[PDB]
């Protein structure tokens, strides 16, 4: 209930902050068709963690653990596998809106890791 309201609140505040103060993230959301004002958390773009070695990027009830489909990269229902995206809002150093190398299921929130990609 209000735990979801908690993470919704500070996760959109984190998204607004990181979208305003990081231009590579702003250009990444505008390559996705994402505006300043987005209501839900699943309209937020998420980049992979492989970026963290290619370009130097720098700007729990607070992490939105989500199991995404490999094609649509949209969340699946709980119980089925998918790519783990995190959406940490504790950081101000770098936008922690990432997708892992990990596959797993999520149960209402405890997050399981089955295997890596390759």
């Amino acid at each position: 209930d209000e735990q979801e309201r908690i993470k919704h609140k500070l996760i959109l505040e984190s998204f607004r902050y990181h979208y305003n103060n990081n231009e590579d993230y702003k250009s990444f959301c505008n390559t996705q068709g994402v505006d300043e004002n987005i209501s839900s958390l699943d309209d937020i773009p998420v980049f992979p963690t492989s970026m963290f070695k290619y370009a130097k990027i720098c700007t729990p009830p607070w992490v939105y653990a989500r199991a995404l489909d490999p094609v649509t990269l949209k969340p699946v229902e709980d119980g089925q596998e998918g790519l783990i995206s995190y959406m940490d809002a504790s950081s101000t150093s770098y936008p922690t809106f990432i997708v892992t190398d990990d596959i797993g299921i999520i149960h209402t929130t405890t997050i399981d890791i089955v295997r890596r990609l390759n």
């Binding site: 390559t31 980049f47 492989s50 490999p70 990269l73 390759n118």
Partner: protein, 477 residues
């Protein structure tokens, strides 16, 4: 629960009491029998007396190809079904594979000219030819061993055909991904004529690299020549488990590229580049991975290539794309979007076009992805052409290949084609800088006597007479 047979002499072995292993090719189980000591002894004792001429060999291959040409051929239908089910091919791609088998088997002039261009004459495999100061005959090596890779069935088919044209006996170890093509080809030989020396020269089997090495080593010891096709570890295994006095034809992993110079007709250019990207799901060694555009309208070519890739999305669809491959596609699309690389993709992640700057970071899955770069001159492409890695250097306006072939060869091209032709290893050329059946053959030389002088001395070669008289340097030209 589908069983794959084992052919040894010219027929399937009685594998009832054998041990079986499953493979899980495309989420579907397939039982292959494990080779035992009796099969190794049967392989060792195989000695087929092959007295056919190249005419007879080519005519038999033509008959087999005409058998494969009929769409009602039961073995062809089964092969297409297995390509669709266990390799994940689309019905179009499987039909195309069967059609290419038929095509390369039924092209007689192509085989004659392969023999002629590689060995010098199509008769050198049956007659003693007076090349110069000698009579040369091309004899087989015998019991050729072929270790197949798995991506392109036509690679294994052409390997077997090359070994057949040189009158070699074939011991084919199928790949862990395509255990059907060699079995289908050998069983087709059997269906045509089971008593033919070519049908009796095929022995198709399978062994893994994780199993005990005794039996595969015993099979490798009776080779006389080895043809390895896989990646790095496959060629390393072939090198480590071959008798040191036996030759190995190595077909390693390659990385082919495309060059678009400045096409006035952009539509055919895009058609060709899309063909090269999409054929065999970009899994071949001649498949285009990076495109290097020269000119002033890279975005017009981008749009036309997008259109042609959308066409290939329908006329030749993708495979089945397991979960991890889908996730790779998505994550790599994200990676390329995070770098303003002008990413475009097709529906159901059918293809991927990425316009990154030259020398940039780009992760390459071989699904149908292609990276296109603006270079502005050929001198900027040559630093990205390696010696034994770049195989095909596709050039789109073929005329422009006449002013680039020299520097591409100097930098290790090994092939220059027309962009609609990357899958066709045209007759008269070479494979990986190597004319393969020059190495599947033993050149036996019958040198003519001392009364036949050389072209430089004009003196009968009497070495004893001139060692007595102490006369050598008066004859040196």
């Amino acid at each position: 629960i589908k069983k794959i047979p084992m052919i040894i002499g010219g027929a399937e072995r009685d594998t009832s009491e054998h041990e079986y292993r499953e493979l899980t090719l495309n989420s579907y189980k397939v039982s292959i029998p494990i080779i035992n000591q009796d099969d190794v002894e049967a392989i060792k004792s195989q000695s087929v007396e092959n007295n056919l001429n190249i005419n007879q060999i080519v005519n038999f291959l033509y008959t087999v190809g005409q058998k494969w040409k009929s769409e009602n051929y039961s073995r062809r239908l089964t092969y297409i079904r297995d390509l669709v089910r266990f390799l994940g091919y689309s019905p179009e791609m499987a039909k195309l594979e069967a059609n290419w088998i038929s095509m390369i088997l039924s092209s007689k002039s192509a085989l004659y000219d392969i023999v002629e261009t590689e060995l010098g004459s199509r008769h050198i495999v049956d007659e003693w030819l007076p090349q110069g100061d000698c009579y040369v005959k091309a004899m087989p090596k015998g019991k050729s061993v072929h270790l197949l890779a798995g991506n392109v069935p036509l690679s294994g088919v052409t390997s077997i055909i090359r070994a057949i044209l040189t009158k070699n006996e074939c011991i084919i170890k199928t790949s862990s991904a395509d255990p059907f093509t060699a079995i289908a080809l050998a069983s087709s030989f059997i269906d045509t004529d089971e008593h033919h020396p070519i049908s009796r020269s095929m022995s198709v089997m399978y062994w893994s690299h994780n199993e005990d090495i005794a039996i595969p080593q015993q099979i490798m010891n009776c080779a006389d020549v080895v043809v390895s096709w896989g990646g790095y570890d496959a060629i390393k295994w072939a090198t480590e488990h071959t008798p040191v006095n036996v030759d190995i034809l190595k077909f390693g992993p390659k990385k082919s590229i495309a060059i678009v110079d400045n096409p006035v007709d952009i539509t055919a250019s895009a058609i060709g580049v899309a063909h090269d990207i999409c054929f065999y799901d970009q899994q071949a060694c001649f498949s285009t991975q990076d495109i290097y555009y020269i000119g002033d309208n890279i975005d017009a070519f981008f749009d036309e290539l997008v259109e042609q890739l959308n066409l290939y999305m329908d006329i030749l669809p993708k495979g089945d794309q397991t979960f991890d491959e889908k996730a790779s596609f998505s994550l790599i699309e994200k990676e390329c979007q995070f770098a303003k690389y002008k990413v475009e993709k097709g529906d159901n992640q059918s293809w991927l076009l990425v316009k990154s700057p030259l020398g940039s970071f780009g992760n390459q899955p071989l699904a149908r992805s292609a990276y296109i770069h603006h270079v502005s001159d050929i001198s900027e492409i040559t630093p990205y052409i390696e010696n034994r890695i770049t195989q095909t250097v596709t050039v789109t306006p073929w005329e422009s290949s006449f002013k680039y072939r020299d520097v591409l060869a100097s930098h290790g091209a090994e092939r220059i084609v027309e962009s609609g032709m990357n899958n066709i290893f045209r007759v008269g050329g070479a494979h990986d800088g190597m004319r393969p059946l020059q190495r599947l053959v033993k050149y036996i030389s019958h040198e003519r006597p001392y009364t036949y002088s050389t072209k430089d001395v004009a003196v009968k070669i009497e070495q004893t007479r001139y060692l007595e008289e102490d006369k050598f340097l008066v004859f040196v030209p």
